[PDB]
Design a protein around this nucleic acid. Structure first.
Ligand SMILES: C[S@@+](CC[C@H](N)C(=O)[O-])C[C@H]1O[C@@H](n2cnc3c(N)ncnc32)[C@H](O)[C@@H]1O
Ligand SMILES: C[S@@+](CC[C@H](N)C(=O)[O-])C[C@H]1O[C@@H](n2cnc3c(N)ncnc32)[C@H](O)[C@@H]1O
Lengths: 464, 529, 529
DNA sequence: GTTGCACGTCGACGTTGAAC
DNA sequence: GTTCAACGTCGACGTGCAAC
């Protein structure tokens, strides 16, 4: 019992004792040209570690500069950490394959002694949450929003035998690879979805098509403007001072709500008295939603659709804009159309980022180009699109559990990798013992019992 | 303080100042002077208050540069004269206003202004109150930079409340600023005294003149503070000009300042304003804040007490900071530390704390060393609602802390650990010496105590102490008591649970607590082996 | 107009000003006055320049408030007097410095200062240049807010370059500010003239006094500008105090201002400083910027020319903005528009443009309407390197624009579309009316022209014209000419390609251009059907 | 009813060089 | 050599009410 339950084999030692050298680095006089000019040796900054493994160096740092600067040359296969940039306390780590390099103050190099400790072992060890928890003890820190190297040295870590450290690290590495694989498939699916978006809207299901004002389109479809089909409304906000308005019972939907997504309800609402005096616009369900301020990434548009049973209705602020479909239209179909990037391209070209920005004019929206498919066809298209999105969500979940699995393994391995039993393989004459799924477990159990019994001979075996 | 319609009214006037060249920080100072002159006229008594030739009409009538120059001239004339009462207000006073057009507009605007925020009788107090409130807004504003002075109102209330200043006691504020603390302290005393009615006349005079003292480096700030006290009826010393003296704490003025029974102050953070540290200290340091701390220790009388708002900076800082801290614990008895939440101050990033300690010890007021045995800490900061305009910081937040704090001003009152407010239980716990060998329930508590030896050994004499972790996660909570005790242990024990679940599924055991315990009995023991 | 060691030296002095209460914006003004007095003494001739009783020694010797008050007095005395030469500099001058300690420190500091940035002979010019450079830094600084005045140096150079001001021509700057444009214009003229040596004495006098004129609302700013011109040897009119007059453009002063052949100015963005629009215009508007535009049109002589920096706001804004915009095209011949990149100005968010137009037309200088037939636009903004301290904005960036612009100041020179600088080709093309019926190559070009009728119809008289997208993507580029022509068409045509690839794989066709063309011939035609 | 911003205000990641 | 910040640098996401 110490930092945590620790096995017989292991000892608890500080990193300082285990590590040959721990030191920071510094920054050179930027003003002088000569220091940077024509330089051979690599220079590293905080950003470097963050981006992947440290293969490359963004900046270059001359040795003349080196002499003058505290910055030093670090050995290869060296662990590194970042003082700043964390959830107050955490810390970062990295390894450097490339030849000896230098860094700055935030970075702290650490060298492990030969065969004393593995670089790989330590790297995972620090990564562990237990490691984080230990550090979190200091707190956000008072006057320090960084990790002090001195504090770093203080850290105590358990030490495995050399053999196990290699084996243990190997196991962890493998998991990391697996997560990456899932990620790849995930990325691909939106690409596929993207293609559908373009093809379906423009192409439609037909086969006979003709030239159109708005690109090549099917013969059956017809063209119309937004204004024809829908109506646009503008809206105003009340005065905060009057508390009377503060009473409520009727919803008001701001852009922030829009950001949230589909919107049945809103965080803030306004009173009927407000609607009467203010003369706000009331909205029925199934109505379209659009975002007038914020813009988005510059001049772009956002959409949403209201929901209601006979029971409720919604009103919104100035920031949001509304549109109503007269007789014939499928709200879901239209909404997807707006979000389509094709619209984005049309819109952006028409207006580049200008002073009027982070917002859309009413004129722009009304003038917008749109196709008019048949009702039945529209419904069919809409259903298809919505379905695809669901798939993306499921994959994300799968990744999450996998991460959880690692967490569990790492925890067990921390305690167990720490026991001598881990270095040693289970006693078995034949490899077949392990081979069976069940058989391997059984063998483990037998070994454990036998070993314990033998250990019983001396207290020291268990005790030490 | 309070403000409403009047502050809005005052705010509009500031627009002229803004356009004038006056800084946001100096809006109040500019307004205050003009209002004072205006009010004097309104009194009708102004001949008594102001000198002839320099009055509201004189300034009012003038226009343009001619007016602006007159204003400057008037300021100088007022500041220097035997009539220290008025002169103090005017001492080191000057207008920031460059644009002549602005001044004319401003004077006329306020001139036409009403008693609008007033009451039966002249509400001179209302103006001052509104003035402070407006000042508060500026203090709140980031752009102004006025915020350096800014302190939370509830914070001040609580500090004085804990201190419980009594009459005949001298309260000092090295960084008086607006004299927020002094006014609060005065208010506290009066509330007890029935407005000093309870006290005899001699004592009453003491409170009015002698009881409170303050020092302000900036003349501009001092003016504001003086006016504040004036409306507050805190006359102070005429020789000095009033309650708030003008001078450098770090300089000769600071040492010259009198000793005080109680000290409540919020010193400036950062390098601070132009304040050269001409004065020597036990441990010389570049740290301005550290310098103040040494000053506070010095001024306090034996057995004195004080609360100091300090940046988190002071708590751990190595080098001299360590030495000074050690000095503090030796000379003073530092009983309590309060860790403030963030977003409260005008500045966002800053972490702050409040220190509570006594000069020496109650038993031995002249105890040079080993004064501080145990320290209590309250974690108000972690896992807290983000404060802001939307989420205000109020007195209620503070109430739990004060309760545990104890009525005794010295902090002597009985204390026990065990505070779980603000969803303390829900918050995550850190792994370490802090929560080492700590039980599950205790680890969660915001209120905890630490030994001096522990701080020395584990902390290495670092005040920066904390157990908790800022997160938000959900996990079933079934653990053994010893498991919870060791924060680090949890990871290992948890791993065992994962496997157990799989076995249970095959068994088809029902979901019951007893079943879980039975399984845990065997499984748990195995891990120990 | 450069700075180095001296500017750093000056910068240090500002620290006193900072601590003093002086704003960042007013550092230069404060320094400039003191330096002027100091320099006068250095001349040894000061008796000639300054009045007795008010000199460097008088100020220098004094200390504290006594000194500060002396300073204010001195400023007033200098500003008002028959000696307009000196008085102009001092006109409407006042010091922002509140803290008396700061003033003493500051005076002494500079007093001990060397000619450090100097040369053989007194380098009065060096100080002024360093002064401007330091001012530039403040202008660059966001916190100061000085940046409102700030304009890119290369931008000014280019503007004057295109304008090609000649001698005997009157150049005006409604928003003179520091008089950056005027100095540049003067420099341009001299460079041509051999420092006016080429010109006769009469003309020379004209250039010195009459040639350039400017107006500044803020007295503080005006002082700086005056000093700038003074070192620049631009005397201007003594009655007015010099080249830069003090007054409101939007007010009576603006109308009083003389007509000018050429106008180059960067008016303030936003609501602007306290400037009431007392003056009537053809189309009254709250828009300050729009107001300036009307002024510029008015002052220009028939056949006059001007370039104005304006925000995007002006281009698109409806309401009166449309009316004014229409008015501009009718009265003036707006040939060119330059879309500036972002990050160049002190303010980050702002989008700016440069308008080029002539009063009426060359053929008919007094042409009331239908002046503007065609407009050329240059998209310097999209797909551009982010500028910043790290990535400076230089003259080189501008060079391509000027080339296409044409030597003719009127903009009459021959022009053709077809500019692909700054990776124009790589930039993404967007789908809209501007790139409607546009070929692939043309769409990419930064330099394009638009018809008046088109602007009227499609744009609905909106200047905000823009063809390109800001993105970064990679896609194979094999398309038919008609496909590329229609931006919108691309999506549809591209879809066809996807299927084609699959078929090709089965065929096992080799990867050759000819093969692709053959397949495209049949496939492409099908889509058309 | 509704329009406009040298915009007004709010999270994410790490200072860098003067100081000793 | 290296230490420290009522933090310094890069964004992120939308004004809201006075004005007409
Ligand atoms: C945070 S403010 C105090 C606010 C005060 N608690 C209140 O109620 O408004 C810190 C003050 O310290 C002052 N100060 C800074 N350096 C000083 C010095 N060397 N001597 C005296 N006062 C100083 C500042 O001018 C500032 O007003
Ligand atoms: C962007 S600055 C001009 C900078 C100038 N191009 C330079 O070289 O430094 C705009 C100027 O307009 C001035 N200004 C604002 N309102 C004005 C008004 N109503 N009349 C005259 N000048 C005004 C400001 O004081 C400011 O100096």
């Amino acid at each position: 019992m110490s930092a945590g339950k620790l096995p017989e084999g292991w000892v608890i030692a500080p990193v300082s004792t285990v590590t040959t050298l721990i030191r920071g680095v510094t920054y050179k006089k930027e003003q002088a040209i000569n220091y940077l000019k024509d330089d051979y040796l690599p220079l590293i900054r905080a950003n470097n570690i963050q981006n992947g493994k440290f293969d490359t160096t963004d900046l270059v740092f001359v040795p003349k500069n080196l002499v003058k600067e505290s910055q030093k040359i670090s050995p290869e296969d060296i662990v590194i950490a970042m003082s700043s940039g964390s959830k107050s306390v955490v810390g970062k780590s990295a390894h450097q394959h490339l030849p000896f390099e230098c860094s700055f103050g935030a970075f702290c190099g650490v060298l492990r002694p030969e065969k004393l400790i593995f670089s790989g072992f330590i790297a995972h060890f620090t990564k562990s949450s237990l490691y984080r928890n230990k550090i979190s003890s200091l707190s956000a820190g008072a006057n320090i929003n960084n990790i002090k190297p001195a504090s770093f040295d203080l850290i105590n870590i358990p030490i495995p035998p050399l053999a196990e450290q290699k084996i243990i690290a190997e196991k962890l590495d493998t998991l990391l690879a697996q997560v990456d694989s899932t990620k790849a498939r995930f990325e691909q699916i939106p690409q596929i979805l993207k293609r559908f978006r373009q093809a379906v809207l423009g192409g439609a299901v037909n086969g006979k098509l003709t030239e159109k004002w708005r690109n090549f389109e099917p013969q059956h479809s017809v063209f119309k403007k937004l204004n024809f089909e829908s109506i646009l409304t503008e809206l105003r906000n009340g005065l905060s001072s009057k508390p009377n308005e503060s009473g409520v019972g009727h919803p008001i939907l701001r852009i922030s709500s829009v950001r949230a997504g589909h919107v049945d309800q809103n965080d803030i609402r306004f009173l009927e008295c407000s609607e009467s005096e203010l003369n706000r616009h009331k909205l029925q369900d199934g109505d379209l939603l659009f975002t007038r301020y914020n813009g988005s990434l510059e001049f772009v548009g956002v959409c949403g659709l209201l929901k209601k049973l006979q029971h409720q209705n919604l009103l919104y602020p100035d920031k949001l804009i509304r549109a109503r479909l007269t007789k014939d239209a499928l709200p879901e179909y239209i909404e997807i159309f707006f979000s389509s990037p094709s619209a984005r391209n049309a819109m952006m070209n028409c207006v580049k980022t200008t002073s009027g920005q982070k917002g859309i004019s009413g004129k722009d929206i009304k003038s917008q180009v749109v196709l008019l498919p048949p009702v039945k066809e529209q419904a069919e298209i809409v259903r298809r699109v919505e379905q695809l999105f669901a798939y993306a969500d499921t994959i994300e979940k799968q990744v999450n559990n996998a991460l959880a699995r690692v967490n569990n393994l790492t925890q067990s391995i921390l305690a167990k990798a720490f026991r001598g039993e881990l270095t040693a393989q289970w006693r078995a004459e034949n490899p077949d013992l392990i081979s069976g799924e069940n058989s391997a477990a059984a063998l483990l159990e037998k070994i454990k019992a036998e070993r314990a019994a033998s250990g019983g001979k001396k207290a020291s075996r268990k005790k030490s | 303080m309070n403000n409403n319609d009047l502050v809005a009214k005052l705010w509009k006037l500031c627009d002229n100042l803004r356009d004038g060249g006056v800084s946001y920080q100096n809006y109040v100072n500019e307004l205050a002077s003009l209002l004072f002159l205006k009010m004097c006229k309104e009194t009708g008594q102004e001949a008594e208050y102001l000198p002839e030739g320099y009055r509201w009409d004189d300034l009012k009538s003038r226009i343009g540069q001619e007016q602006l120059q007159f204003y400057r001239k008037m300021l100088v004339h007022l500041g220097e004269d035997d009539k220290k009462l008025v002169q103090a207000v005017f001492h080191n006073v000057s207008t920031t206003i460059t644009e002549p057009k602005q001044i004319t507009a401003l004077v006329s605007n306020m001139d036409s202004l009403d008693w609008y925020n007033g009451a039966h009788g002249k509400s001179r107090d209302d103006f001052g109150d509104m003035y402070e409130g407006l000042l508060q807004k500026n203090a709140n504003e980031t752009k102004s930079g006025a915020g350096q002075y800014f302190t939370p109102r509830p914070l001040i209330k609580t500090i004085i409340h804990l201190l419980k200043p009594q009459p005949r006691e001298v309260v000092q504020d090295p960084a008086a600023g607006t004299a927020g603390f002094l006014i609060e302290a005065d208010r506290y005393v009066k509330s007890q005294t029935n407005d000093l009615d309870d006290l005899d006349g001699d004592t009453q005079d003491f409170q009015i003149h002698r009881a409170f003292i303050g020092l302000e480096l900036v003349p501009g700030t001092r003016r504001l503070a003086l006016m504040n006290c004036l409306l507050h009826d805190i006359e102070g010393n005429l020789d000095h000009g009033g309650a708030i003296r003008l001078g450098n704490t770090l300089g000769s003025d600071g040492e010259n300042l009198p000793k005080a029974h109680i000290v409540a102050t919020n010193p400036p953070f950062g390098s601070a304003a132009g304040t050269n540290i001409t004065r020597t200290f036990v441990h010389p340091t570049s740290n301005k804040q550290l310098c103040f701390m040494q000053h506070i220790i010095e001024t306090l009388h034996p057995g004195g007490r004080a609360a100091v708002v300090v940046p988190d900076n002071v708590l751990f800082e190595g080098g001299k900071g360590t030495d000074i801290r050690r000095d503090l614990m030796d000379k003073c008895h530092l009983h309590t530390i309060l860790r403030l939440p963030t977003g409260i101050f005008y500045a966002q990033g800053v972490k702050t704390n409040v220190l509570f300690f006594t000069k020496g010890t109650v038993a031995n007021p002249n105890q040079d060393k080993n004064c501080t045995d145990d320290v209590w800490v309250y974690d108000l900061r972690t896992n807290m609602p983000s404060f802001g305009k939307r989420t205000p910081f109020t007195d209620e937040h503070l109430q739990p802390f004060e309760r545990v704090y104890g009525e005794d001003p010295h902090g002597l009152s009985p204390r026990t650990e065990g505070e779980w407010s603000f969803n303390a239980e829900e918050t995550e716990v850190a792994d370490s010496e802090e929560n080492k060998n700590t039980d599950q329930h205790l680890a969660t508590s915001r209120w905890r105590k630490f030994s001096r030896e522990w701080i020395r050994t584990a902390k290495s004499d670092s005040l920066d102490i904390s157990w908790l972790k800022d997160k938000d996660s959900i996990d079933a909570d079934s653990l053994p008591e010893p498991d919870v005790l060791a924060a680090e242990a949890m990871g290992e024990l948890v791993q065992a649970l994962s496997e157990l679940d799989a076995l249970m599924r095959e068994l088809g055991a029902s979901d019951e607590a007893d079943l879980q315990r039975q399984l845990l009995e065997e499984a748990f023991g195995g891990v120990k082996e």
